[PDB]
C-alpha cells in the first residue's frame, strides 16, 4: 500500500505517534516519506546482509527477524514479514521501541538527513486530522 501524505498523518495520529516520546507527528510522516516514500511494502537489502522493511524501513539485524540476517537480535520480538502489511500497527509498535532508545529517531538515517532540523510540522499541515 502507498499512503497519501495526509492519509498517513491521520493513521499515525490514530496510532499514537503525535508527541510520542518528544517527537511531534510531522517527524514520523517526514520519516516515512524519505525512508520508504510512504510504501508499506518497501524493502532494501543492505550490504551487511540485513534488510530494512516497511514504511519505516525497520532493520532485520537489530529489530525484526527475517531468518536470513547474521547477528540478528530481534529487539522488537517480531518477524519482519509483519512489518510489510498495509496495516501499520506492527511497524508503529516496533518504531516506538526503537525511538525509546537514547538515539531516538536518529536510528532512521533518511529522517536524520532529510527531516531533522527542518520544519517537520509542514508534513501534517493542509490535512484533515
Amino acid at each position: 500500500k502507498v499512503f497519501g501524505r495526509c492519509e498517513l498523518a491521520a493513521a499515525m495520529k490514530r496510532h499514537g505517534l503525535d508527541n510520542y516520546r518528544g517527537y511531534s507527528l510531522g517527524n514520523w510522516v517526514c520519516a516515512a516519506k524519505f525512508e520508504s516514500n510512504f510504501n508499506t511494502q518497501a524493502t532494501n537489502r543492505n550490504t551487511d546482509g540485513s534488510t530494512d522493511y516497511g514504511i519505516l524501513q525497520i532493520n532485520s539485524r537489530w529489530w525484526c527477524n527475517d531468518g536470513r540476517t547474521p547477528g540478528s537480535r530481534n529487539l522488537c520480538n517480531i518477524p519482519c514479514s509483519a512489518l510489510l502489511s498495509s496495516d501499520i500497527t506492527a511497524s508503529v509498535n516496533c518504531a516506538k521501541k526503537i525511538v525509546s532508545d537514547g538515539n531516538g529517531m536518529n536510528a532512521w538515517v533518511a529522517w536524520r538527513n532529510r527531516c531533522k532540523g527542518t520544519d517537520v510540522q509542514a508534513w501534517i499541515r493542509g490535512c484533515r486530522l
Partner: antibody
Framework: DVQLQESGPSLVKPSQTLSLTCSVT????????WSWIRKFPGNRLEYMGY???????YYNPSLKSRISITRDTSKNQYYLDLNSVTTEDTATYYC???????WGQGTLVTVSA | DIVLTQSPATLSVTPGNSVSLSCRAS??????LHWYQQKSHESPRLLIK???QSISGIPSRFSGSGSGTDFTLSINSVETEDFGMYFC?????????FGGGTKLEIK
C-alpha cells in the same frame, strides 16, 4: 523461553546503597531493553527506569538521581543500585523487560534501622 | 509527569457479570496506555497494550478501548480468576507512570 529472577538482600539500613540483581535465562540481555519497577505498601507502582540496547538509560526523576541501572553480558544479568535509601524505599522490587511480557517474581526489600 | 487516575478505586462483582474499569490521563497520550493485572504476592501481567491491542495468552474476555485522555478496560463475564488489582500505565512520555489501580473483588 525467557525467565527473569531478582536476587539480593531483603533487609537494608537507612543511608546505604540498595543493590538488586536480575538474572535472565533463555536469551541474551543484548536482545532487549530492561527495566526495574517497584510497588510501595499501598498498591502504588512506580516505574524506576530502564536501560536500552545502546546502553542509554532513562531514570524516573522521582528517584532524584540516586539510581543506576547497569548490565553484565558475560553473566547475562542487569542490576539496580539505589543510593542513600530511606524507609520510603521499602517496597517490592521487580525486574521486567521493556515490553512487559516477562517479569521476575518480585522481591521485598525493607529499609529499617 | 502525566498523571493517570483510575476509577472506581474498588469494584465488587458477581462472577458472570461484566465490568468496565476507567483510566483517565492528565494530558493526551494517544493510544499509549497499557493495562496490567496483579494478584496478591504475584508480579504484574500485561493484559492489553496500546489501548486496544490484544496479547497472546490472555483471555478473550479482556478488551480495551479509548484514546487521548479517556481509556477503559472491559471484562466480558468476570471469572473467579479475574479478581485482583488492575493498573493502567502510559508510555507516551518519560517517566512512564501508573494509575492508582482498581481492585476487582467478588461482591
Amino acid at each position: 523461553d525467557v525467565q527473569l529472577q531478582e536476587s539480593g538482600p531483603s533487609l537494608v539500613k537507612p543511608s546505604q546503597t540498595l543493590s538488586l540483581t536480575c538474572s535472565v535465562t533463555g536469551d541474551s540481555i543484548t536482545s532487549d531493553f530492561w527495566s526495574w519497577i517497584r510497588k510501595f505498601p499501598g498498591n502504588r507502582l512506580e516505574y524506576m527506569g530502564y536501560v536500552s540496547y545502546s546502553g542509554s538509560t532513562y531514570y524516573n526523576p522521582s528517584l532524584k538521581s540516586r539510581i543506576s541501572i547497569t548490565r553484565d553480558t558475560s553473566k547475562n544479568q542487569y542490576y539496580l543500585d539505589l543510593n542513600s535509601v530511606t524507609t520510603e524505599d521499602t517496597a517490592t522490587y521487580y525486574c521486567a523487560n521493556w515490553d512487559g511480557d516477562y517479569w521476575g517474581q518480585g522481591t521485598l526489600v525493607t529499609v529499617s534501622a | 509527569d502525566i498523571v493517570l487516575t483510575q476509577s472506581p478505586a474498588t469494584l465488587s462483582v458477581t462472577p458472570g457479570n461484566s465490568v468496565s474499569l476507567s483510566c483517565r490521563a492528565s494530558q493526551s497520550i494517544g493510544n499509549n496506555l497499557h493495562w496490567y493485572q496483579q494478584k496478591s504476592h504475584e508480579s504484574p501481567r500485561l493484559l492489553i497494550k496500546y489501548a486496544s491491542q490484544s496479547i497472546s495468552g490472555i483471555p478473550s474476555r479482556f478488551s480495551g478501548s479509548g484514546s487521548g485522555t479517556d481509556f477503559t478496560l472491559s471484562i466480558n463475564s468476570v471469572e473467579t480468576e479475574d479478581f485482583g488489582m488492575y493498573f493502567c500505565q502510559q508510555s507516551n512520555s518519560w517517566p512512564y507512570t501508573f494509575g492508582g489501580g482498581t481492585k476487582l473483588e467478588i461482591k
